[PDB]
């Protein structure tokens, strides 16, 4: 008899690429990729995941918290991963702000990029004794408290001249010292109040536009105020007001003093943010539901099965599959062979 070596023949619908034989049909494969499905976002397995800056602070927005709105002062937990859920963060109370006139909306998004964030317990500047005559610390019914009808942002002080016969002033300069640790960045919040002609005279003794300039870390910004004819109030406390505030922030690296040059209507910094480390940030939505190996901007939370994935590439954090252009497969069979017969 004759005895020979041979290879099986079976249905071979699967195709893989080779270098020397081109595409070939094989009896079996191991898929290396899947296309994920869009799911809700979730907590990152093995990593505390930040959503709202202060989750215990109810009816508060991240921006409200960042500005130190009354009722919105609380604990801001540390996190090595964060979800950016507001590309344009809004306020939901206190005194009316002309937001788009500065970079202020992005303040809470800057904070979430740090691992640890805390609001200072002491004031960085003594507002009452600040340059430009003694000031009383202004308040407003627009900013209520559980135990008060009136108040103001914890991060700022509405410095208004105490003295009768208050009058116009030359631009004054304050230094803003760095009061955080050597390991922390300081984010200083400041701004200015403006109003209509009469109200300006009452409050400040000048009805002309006021000028403001900040300088920190090599960055200079310049602002000129507006007298009357303001755009409508929005994202505020609901009370009609004749004036508006403009709010800004400046970042000070450890050991770096910042300065503010101001006139009337100045909102001097008080409690400042102290921030250290880095948090992994990606875009997503709230709420966080469950655990996942990986957080993905286009698919939300997902668990890692296959090593690779196909679909839309985007930013993604955690234990994630690696994006590929095509659905790769590993050969797990033999190359196709026509069935052999005798006659």
């Amino acid at each position: 008899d004759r005895i020979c070596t041979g290879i099986t023949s079976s249905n071979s619908p699967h195709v893989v690429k080779t270098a020397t034989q081109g595409e070939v049909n094989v009896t079996g494969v191991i898929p290396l990729t899947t296309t994920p499905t869009k799911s809700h976002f979730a907590n990152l397995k093995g990593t505390k995941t930040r959503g709202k800056l202060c989750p215990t602070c109810l009816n508060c927005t991240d921006l409200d918290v960042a500005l130190g709105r009354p009722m919105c002062v609380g604990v801001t937990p540390s996190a090595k991963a964060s979800i950016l859920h507001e590309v344009r963060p809004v306020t939901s109370g206190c005194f009316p702000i002309m937001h788009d006139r500065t970079k202020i909306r992005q303040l809470p998004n800057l904070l979430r990029g740090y691992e640890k964030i805390r609001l200072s317990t002491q004031n960085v500047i003594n507002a009452e004794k600040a340059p430009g005559g003694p000031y009383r610390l202004g308040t407003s019914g627009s900013c209520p408290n559980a135990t008060s009808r009136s108040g103001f942002f914890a991060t700022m002080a509405w410095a208004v001249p105490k003295d009768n016969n208050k009058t116009a002033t030359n631009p004054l300069t304050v230094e803003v010292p760095h009061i955080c640790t050597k390991e922390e960045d300081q984010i200083t919040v400041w701004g200015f109040h403006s109003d209509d002609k009469t109200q300006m005279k009452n409050l400040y003794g000048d009805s002309n536009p006021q000028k403001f300039t900040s300088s920190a870390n090599g960055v200079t910004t310049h602002y000129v105020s507006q007298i009357g004819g303001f755009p409508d109030q929005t994202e505020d406390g609901g009370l009609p007001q004749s004036g508006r505030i403009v709010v800004d922030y400046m970042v000070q690296k450890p050991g770096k003093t910042g300065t503010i040059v101001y006139q009337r209507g100045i909102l001097l910094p008080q409690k400042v943010w102290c921030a250290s480390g880095r948090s992994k940030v990606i875009k997503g939505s709230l709420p966080l539901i469950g655990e996942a190996d990986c957080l993905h901007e286009k698919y939300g939370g997902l668990n890692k099965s296959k090593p690779y994935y196909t679909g839309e590439h985007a930013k993604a954090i955690g234990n994630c599959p690696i994006w590929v252009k095509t659905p790769l497969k590993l050969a797990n069979g033999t190359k196709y062979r026509p069935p052999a017969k005798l006659l």
């Binding site: 008899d1 070596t5 099986t8 940030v281 033999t334 026509p338 052999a340």
Partner: protein, 170 residues
Amino acid sequence: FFGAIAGFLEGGWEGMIAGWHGYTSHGAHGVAVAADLKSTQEAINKITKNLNSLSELEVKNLQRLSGAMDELHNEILELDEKVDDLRADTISSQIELAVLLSNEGIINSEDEHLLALERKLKKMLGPSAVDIGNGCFETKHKCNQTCLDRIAAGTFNAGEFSLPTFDSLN
């Protein structure tokens, strides 16, 4: 390509169900087929190890810049988007390459499994069988399905047909 040049059978046997490669016998019984489980397991383990190796690759996460804010730093964010895209592109190509080499390896080794199975067959048949060179041996005896199955199991003894055998070293 080896088998093509060497005149190995280019067809396959549907009867071979319990494995990927093995043996056929041709005589008065017609044609018997038996899969060799050792050779099949070897291939499967190589592929399995290969799968593990490809699954061990780790790359850095791509996340947002912590300092670059929307609107304020659009220019920076455009470059950041570019870096992400080029990263995804480059690693993708590298992975496709690794996979391609893997598959090239698996398909190519087929003829090597046959060559190995031929060595195993040669020893079991004993010195009375003649080697044709195309993966086939001519024998003095009949080998039906029962005989072929014992070859696939490595239990075949040529002494049962009163033919010479090779003894194994202790």
